Design an enzyme around this catalytic site. Sequence first.
Site, PDB file in Angstrom:
ATOM      1  N   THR B  34     -59.414  75.819 -41.147  1.00 46.80           N
ATOM      2  CA  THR B  34     -59.681  76.078 -42.558  1.00 46.80           C
ATOM      3  C   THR B  34     -61.168  76.147 -42.901  1.00 46.80           C
ATOM      4  O   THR B  34     -62.026  75.692 -42.151  1.00 46.80           O
ATOM      5  CB  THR B  34     -59.095  74.976 -43.476  1.00 46.80           C
ATOM      6  OG1 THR B  34     -59.724  73.743 -43.092  1.00 46.80           O
ATOM      7  CG2 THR B  34     -57.603  74.828 -43.294  1.00 46.80           C
ATOM      8  N   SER B  35     -61.466  76.690 -44.088  1.00 46.43           N
ATOM      9  CA  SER B  35     -62.837  76.752 -44.590  1.00 46.43           C
ATOM     10  C   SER B  35     -63.372  75.393 -45.006  1.00 46.43           C
ATOM     11  O   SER B  35     -62.603  74.622 -45.595  1.00 46.43           O
ATOM     12  CB  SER B  35     -62.911  77.745 -45.766  1.00 46.43           C
ATOM     13  OG  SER B  35     -62.760  79.048 -45.210  1.00 46.43           O
ATOM     14  N   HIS B  93     -65.954  71.725 -37.688  1.00 49.07           N
ATOM     15  CA  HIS B  93     -64.763  71.069 -37.181  1.00 49.07           C
ATOM     16  C   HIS B  93     -65.055  70.502 -35.774  1.00 49.07           C
ATOM     17  O   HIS B  93     -65.985  70.951 -35.111  1.00 49.07           O
ATOM     18  CB  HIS B  93     -63.557  72.009 -37.074  1.00 49.07           C
ATOM     19  CG  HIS B  93     -62.990  72.488 -38.380  1.00 49.07           C
ATOM     20  ND1 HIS B  93     -62.322  71.667 -39.258  1.00 49.07           N
ATOM     21  CD2 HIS B  93     -62.993  73.719 -38.956  1.00 49.07           C
ATOM     22  CE1 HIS B  93     -61.940  72.378 -40.323  1.00 49.07           C
ATOM     23  NE2 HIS B  93     -62.333  73.625 -40.162  1.00 49.07           N
ATOM     24  N   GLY B  94     -64.241  69.541 -35.334  1.00 47.62           N
ATOM     25  CA  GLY B  94     -64.465  68.959 -33.998  1.00 47.62           C
ATOM     26  C   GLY B  94     -63.266  68.171 -33.493  1.00 47.62           C
ATOM     27  O   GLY B  94     -62.274  67.950 -34.194  1.00 47.62           O
ATOM     28  N   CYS B 135     -65.012  65.928 -36.978  1.00 51.49           N
ATOM     29  CA  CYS B 135     -63.934  65.011 -36.587  1.00 51.49           C
ATOM     30  C   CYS B 135     -64.048  64.602 -35.111  1.00 51.49           C
ATOM     31  O   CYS B 135     -64.576  65.382 -34.307  1.00 51.49           O
ATOM     32  CB  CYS B 135     -62.601  65.702 -36.918  1.00 51.49           C
ATOM     33  SG  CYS B 135     -62.237  65.679 -38.701  1.00 51.49           S
TER      34      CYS B 135
END
Lengths: 146, 146, 4, 4, 94, 94
Positions: B34-35, B93-94, B135
């Site tokens: 997601t954005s 993100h991660g 994350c």
Amino acid sequence: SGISLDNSYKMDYPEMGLCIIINNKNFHKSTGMTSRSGTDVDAANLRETFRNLKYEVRNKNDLTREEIVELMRDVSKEDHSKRSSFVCVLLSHGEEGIIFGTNGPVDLKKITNFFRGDRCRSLTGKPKLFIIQACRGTELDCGIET
Amino acid sequence: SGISLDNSYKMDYPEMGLCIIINNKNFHKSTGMTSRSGTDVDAANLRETFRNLKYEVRNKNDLTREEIVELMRDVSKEDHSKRSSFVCVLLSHGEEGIIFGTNGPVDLKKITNFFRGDRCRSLTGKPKLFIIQACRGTELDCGIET
Amino acid sequence: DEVX
Amino acid sequence: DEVX
Amino acid sequence: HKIPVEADFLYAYSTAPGYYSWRNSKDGSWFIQSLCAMLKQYADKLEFMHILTRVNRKVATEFESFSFDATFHAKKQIPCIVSMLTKELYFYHH
Amino acid sequence: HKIPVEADFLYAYSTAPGYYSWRNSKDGSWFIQSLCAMLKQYADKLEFMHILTRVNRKVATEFESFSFDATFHAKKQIPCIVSMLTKELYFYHH
């Protein structure tokens, strides 16, 4: 009174707290792990150092994976209300995320989870220190000259 | 001269150093990510904060995994001899050990390895700072009341 | 010298 | 609030 | 009104993630030798993260392995401080 | 005469290992919001590990999630400082 700040942990409770030292030197033959020569020098240095800082030191030698988990459980169920802090030192073989008992491995998260803010209430808000002398894998650092 | 101590990094070279900010907000549709609404607020706050600390800031937006690795390689091949330090900020993100480009993942060790003491010689002995907003898995902390 |  |  | 359940922990690891850790059979481990020496000299003087920073410098500068095996010879070590603490820690008080 | 190749790195992670990290769509991420505020107030005053310790306390005490989904509601966060540094770091000089 006058102006008051809160940037440091309170360390003047009646006791500094427990220092648990787990010293694993000799391992069961079936595991194939070698003896850790030199580790009794380490365990004696730590007992004298934390004695001079006024910690109640308890030394334990050559514990199985079952014995390590029962020791940690029972210590986390003591009343630490008059203690400022908690210290645990682990001396053994290891890999990433794991420490060895004399007959096999223990995940480090299993040990530290007994002391979580919601599971050991007389240590909530107080510093919990884990000191770990163990391998974290098999890479070697070649260094660079300065 | 008089007595001299060496307990702190030298930070009075002619330049403080580079601050690279990688801001990934929009991801390719096929990845299903997601954005990241709010991340431009973060990127603007960081640029103003490190500007006031006298860092040379460079901002980059929506980079692919290939673009992230080529940027890091080229920056590690610059001459940092007149710079005191290096700063890199990653916003994406991660998962544990990984950061996402807009089209797939990059291992964090691949990025930091370009700056190792033996591979970036004009930064040997100098502080290298990596700041990571991402994350590290899917656990949630329920907290404990105080 | 030995490793852990 | 959202997660990364 | 709440705090995270993972707050107020400190992990002082002897080596970086993925790496072996070194021990001398006569003198003890590089990291514990160095930790005890710096606590003895600075616990009445310095905050605990600054004590552990001096432990990092001692291990990184004063030790190097010696081996008849080329794979294990002339190797180095850096310890790894992992802090989830929310305040400064001093071992003394007023 | 040598130093480790992994020495002099600092990793300032927004959350503990294995955990999600939280971001507000209007105000930005909990960790970056807090990091920038503490650098603005203390970079001319405090050593960098003590600045990051005040960032840990701000994130842990001042934020809590709000969600219509019970699984994600009322959750907390603690950042994670990982230091391989060998000296104190101050952003100012004499």
